[PDB]
Enzyme design. Structure first.
Site, PDB file in Angstrom:
ATOM      1  N   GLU A  47       0.825  -1.195   0.000  1.00  0.00           N
ATOM      2  CA  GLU A  47       0.000   0.000   0.000  1.00  0.00           C
ATOM      3  C   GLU A  47       0.867   1.256   0.000  1.00  0.00           C
ATOM      4  O   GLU A  47       1.854   1.339   0.732  1.00  0.00           O
ATOM      5  CB  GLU A  47      -0.919  -0.052   1.216  1.00  0.00           C
ATOM      6  CG  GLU A  47      -1.690   1.187   1.461  1.00  0.00           C
ATOM      7  CD  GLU A  47      -2.324   1.165   2.809  1.00  0.00           C
ATOM      8  OE1 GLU A  47      -1.678   0.606   3.733  1.00  0.00           O
ATOM      9  OE2 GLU A  47      -3.439   1.729   2.947  1.00  0.00           O
ATOM     10  N   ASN A 109      -7.240   5.910  -1.955  1.00  0.00           N
ATOM     11  CA  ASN A 109      -6.142   5.022  -1.580  1.00  0.00           C
ATOM     12  C   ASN A 109      -6.314   3.772  -2.445  1.00  0.00           C
ATOM     13  O   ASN A 109      -7.160   2.920  -2.165  1.00  0.00           O
ATOM     14  CB  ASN A 109      -6.183   4.742  -0.080  1.00  0.00           C
ATOM     15  CG  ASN A 109      -5.015   3.920   0.414  1.00  0.00           C
ATOM     16  OD1 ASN A 109      -4.491   3.076  -0.306  1.00  0.00           O
ATOM     17  ND2 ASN A 109      -4.595   4.164   1.656  1.00  0.00           N
ATOM     18  N   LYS A 126      -9.663   2.032  -1.639  1.00  0.00           N
ATOM     19  CA  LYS A 126      -9.835   1.577  -0.268  1.00  0.00           C
ATOM     20  C   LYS A 126     -11.208   1.971   0.277  1.00  0.00           C
ATOM     21  O   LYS A 126     -11.593   3.139   0.223  1.00  0.00           O
ATOM     22  CB  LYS A 126      -8.701   2.164   0.569  1.00  0.00           C
ATOM     23  CG  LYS A 126      -8.450   1.521   1.884  1.00  0.00           C
ATOM     24  CD  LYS A 126      -7.290   2.245   2.553  1.00  0.00           C
ATOM     25  CE  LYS A 126      -6.857   1.549   3.834  1.00  0.00           C
ATOM     26  NZ  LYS A 126      -5.521   1.979   4.303  1.00  0.00           N
ATOM     27  N   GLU A 145      -5.693   9.151   7.523  1.00  0.00           N
ATOM     28  CA  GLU A 145      -6.200   8.611   6.258  1.00  0.00           C
ATOM     29  C   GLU A 145      -7.557   9.190   5.870  1.00  0.00           C
ATOM     30  O   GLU A 145      -7.835   9.359   4.679  1.00  0.00           O
ATOM     31  CB  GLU A 145      -6.305   7.086   6.320  1.00  0.00           C
ATOM     32  CG  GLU A 145      -5.236   6.361   5.531  1.00  0.00           C
ATOM     33  CD  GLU A 145      -5.517   4.884   5.365  1.00  0.00           C
ATOM     34  OE1 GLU A 145      -6.479   4.542   4.642  1.00  0.00           O
ATOM     35  OE2 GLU A 145      -4.760   4.066   5.922  1.00  0.00           O
ATOM     36  N   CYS A 171      -4.761  -2.970   3.053  1.00  0.00           N
ATOM     37  CA  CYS A 171      -4.392  -2.675   4.435  1.00  0.00           C
ATOM     38  C   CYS A 171      -5.461  -3.107   5.441  1.00  0.00           C
ATOM     39  O   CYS A 171      -5.799  -4.289   5.549  1.00  0.00           O
ATOM     40  CB  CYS A 171      -4.120  -1.175   4.589  1.00  0.00           C
ATOM     41  SG  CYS A 171      -3.137  -0.670   6.028  1.00  0.00           S
ATOM     42  N   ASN A 196       0.353  -1.039   5.318  1.00  0.00           N
ATOM     43  CA  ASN A 196       1.221  -0.394   6.302  1.00  0.00           C
ATOM     44  C   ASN A 196       0.548  -0.431   7.666  1.00  0.00           C
ATOM     45  O   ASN A 196      -0.429   0.288   7.907  1.00  0.00           O
ATOM     46  CB  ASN A 196       1.522   1.050   5.928  1.00  0.00           C
ATOM     47  CG  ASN A 196       2.054   1.172   4.570  1.00  0.00           C
ATOM     48  OD1 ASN A 196       3.249   1.364   4.393  1.00  0.00           O
ATOM     49  ND2 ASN A 196       1.177   1.073   3.577  1.00  0.00           N
TER      50      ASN A 196
END
Lengths: 304, 307, 307, 304
Positions: A47, A109, A126, A145, A171, A196
């Protein structure tokens, strides 16, 4: 569809604020040739692999766009595609997608999946954004985020790829049973998840002795409970005084880890993944049909 | 002890088709006494704990009822209810419910939850029935639970009980991520899952080496992914030539295993369970803001099977 | 890289006593060619990989020798040595040794280490023979390894091979802490342990649930407590209606498992094994934080049994 | 109930420099009353249970003697013994023994094993001393056990106690296979081990992600490879900004973890332990005398 595919888990070491994109992209190309000298037809990147994990850094909501990408094959990222196409390797690449729609800017993302012929198979964005939108003072490290990303409009798509049924989550997507189950009900045989995970808890400022417990527990169960290969590749290391968790693993349809990365830097784990083993186990109707009774799962769709 | 219970997993040994009821029930009372000697407030018995695993035997669909229960506390199972009220110990107890409901007889794979005062907190009726309804003669052993039980009309209820929110599930419900989520989405804090899992593969006549891995795997991720206590109580041992896996565990809302049985027999495991870790770990789902999206999930509630 | 070896574990499927030697050896060769398609520099084969497990069979203490080797590269095993040299791969290969040593005819349970250039580096002869000398009728399956093999006279040797220090041990050697220690006390950088382990326990004729747990456990602590790599390669599968355990594994000097086998058939795992990590951990996990005091470790050689 | 002893693992939380010994001894007495009220016959306290882990602090080599003990039932510790006696509970107690002899001062990392009738069954003194002796500035945190302690002069004594064969080892003893083997060849059925393990690596000041992995793997395999119950009990918590792991476990002779602690604070894990199961496994194969060939184990007495 089903067969036997060699995946490279191309784990990444740290990236810093300081590093030039050329360095980072050479670092991906190096892993790529490694997977290549190893027969890997598919290689999975983590990611936000073109970047540092800038969500630990506070800035205006348009204050991160330098870390993002204006187009997917970029001047910056184009040698990575030339090489992958030249060696005939496909790759999942996580990054921060910058995109314009009705004249506003939209920031996702994202992970892009590219077939061995060099042509994109798809793009996941994401769904589950962790963190917080605002600066929260009482926390040893920050996780914004939500501040720098919108919930993706992709959904949890499963594609006809690499001779099987390939899906992509990102993630912390990997802690929710929905991500696996949604792709599951699509016959997914290979879920690719780059990630991550910070090693410490932000609330306490201390390290999560259970951190890899949870990292592997969620993925093995996903695999097993859904009869699917699951590949988890880390960007680990200490970036700018912030340590990320390694432990990248290729996980079988049965829940078995078959490959584990021992470092917190660049590491290429690798394993041959029979996609057809998946289709076999999915034939549990023989005995344990235990057939989906959606009449009772209804709460999963009013919230979850 | 802000909201803390000492649960016992009273894993059971084998039950033959030649075992007397009073035997079966005295054994149950045996383990209930054991728990009182260790201050257990709740006691979780296994699935179908008043009878052998008759789903491995073939017969007419109405041909197994000599095993069921004409009422839940009956003359046979009454002394188990009395010796628990007397001791002030709640329990969960799995049996084969025979009941006349909707103007016709009905048959379920049931667990009842009895609070300490001796009063029934709730019933749950198994939703996920595995196996086959016709004799499948290329397998070493038969799993005919489809033939002998009807799907449950209970839903996955969660109840105010034992100072917190406590639900129940049975056996291979612990294989289905849904089981936990649905209950997790009613603020569950304890989930009582008794079970029977034959060790050998039905179509391989040979043991599943991953038999136990998978046992604790699905239950541990379930505790974690719903910050809920998950107690799994087996009935285990060689029952008329068929070996049932052991492995009873108490698993904490971190996914951590805090109590394991080591026998395939009558055995008890005890842990204090702070029902408050569960409530606290749920509101540290704020930095990990789910802000979870039920719109991307609709495949879970639409299709039965798989596209 | 820095003293790195791409090691391959070549776990083998079953071998019946009907299997020809040409079959067994082609299969050995089959895996060796595979290991070259993956750029393996070393190929670790199982124990007794040139015949089935004749310890499960009763016979005259000298009437097993059709399973032994006249010489180590013999006319039958010659092809496998040729094809390994022709490709540049070293290997370790478990067999049953028939040699006319000390005048008499002697019989061991042997592995042999062969380097890339094609040249024998060493030979280890099993020290720990398990089971029993005699037929034992109350056991579900026999283990007559004491009856067909003498104790090994090599000692746990550690040679300079493959860029570092590599030792050998066989099967249930991997249970005794002594195995890794002795060999680790010789600065072993890598330990090759091939094995055949039945899954059923001989008294119950029932599979030990903790059969693989023990398997990995004893080899993981060994890698850890001697900062050495531990490559353990099984022969697995139902062999003439006897099932051997699978679970082959490369364990890193940290104790971490980095490659597993999911099958009980002919299967090959691969992992790049940085022999430098071993020497890193050795001068740090044996920091001045470790000082080893042999004055107290004296019972390990004083006696052979408990008091 | 017979050949069967109910052990309680009495994990502690932090003990900071700024505590009274009256606070600490009360906190152990508190734990003792929980083992009584849960049914325990033996209750195992950790290493250095009567003070902070002072081997992280630099001082003269007689400087940390305020954390040591005059004699075992002290003025300070005499209430712990009287209580244990009344409730008829035996305990293992770790501490820094200060013992005078030939006009000189000798100093040990010592655990005393007290029987249910109040009488001392024995004493073990650590053999394996970690850390260094002099100050070292290149590590984020210090171990000076070698500076403040001497190698103990008891060895791995196994005694007759609690109807069984009971031995003791201390803290990082538990990493050395010799610890368990030595005691196993004495027919040990129950090994008591208290411990304090800093969870950062001294060199990098990084948390050892494998710390709890390593903490359980050494003890499990010790139990298994020597057919013994192994009880491991921590002092955990943040002591003055240094954190110790938790992970207190009772371990079977199978190597199976049967009880585990979830906090890094005062916690009593408890389990019922058939000491006869050991002798079953000990005499159902796993005979040392049958397979042991110590002509080949000789290096274990010459070098280590």
């Amino acid at each position: 569809m089903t067969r036997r595919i060699r995946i490279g888990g191309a784990q990444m070491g740290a990236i810093s604020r300081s590093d030039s994109k050329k360095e980072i992209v050479d670092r991906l190309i190096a892993l790529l040739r490694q997977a290549s000298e190893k027969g890997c037809e598919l290689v999975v990147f983590p990611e936000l692999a073109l970047s540092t994990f800038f969500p630990r850094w506070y800035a205006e909501r348009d204050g991160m766009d330098g870390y993002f990408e204006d187009g997917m094959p970029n001047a910056a990222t184009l040698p990575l595609f030339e090489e992958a196409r030249r060696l005939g390797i496909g790759f999942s690449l996580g990054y921060a997608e910058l995109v314009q729609e009705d004249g506003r800017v939209r920031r996702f993302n994202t992970t892009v999946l590219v077939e061995r012929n060099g042509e994109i198979v798809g793009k996941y964005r994401k769904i589950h954004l962790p963190g917080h939108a605002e600066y929260e003072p009482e926390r040893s490290h920050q996780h914004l985020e939500k501040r720098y990303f919108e919930v993706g409009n992709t959904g949890f798509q499963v594609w006809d790829a690499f001779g099987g049924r390939v899906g992509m989550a990102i993630c912390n997507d990997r802690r929710w049973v929905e991500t696996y189950r949604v792709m599951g009900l699509q016959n997914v045989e290979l879920i690719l998840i780059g990630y991550n995970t910070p090693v410490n808890d932000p609330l306490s400022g201390e390290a999560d002795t259970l951190g890899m417990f949870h990292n592997h527990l969620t993925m093995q169960a996903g695999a097993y409970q859904n009869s699917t290969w699951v590949v988890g590749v880390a960007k680990a290391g200490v970036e700018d005084g912030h340590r990320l968790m390694g432990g990248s693993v290729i996980v079988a349809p049965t829940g078995e880890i078959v490959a584990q990365a021992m470092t917190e830097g660049d590491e290429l784990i690798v394993a041959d993944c029979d996609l057809d083993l998946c289709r076999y186990y999915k034939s549990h109707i023989f005995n344990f049909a235990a057939h989906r009774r959606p009449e009772f799962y209804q709460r999963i769709t009013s919230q979850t």
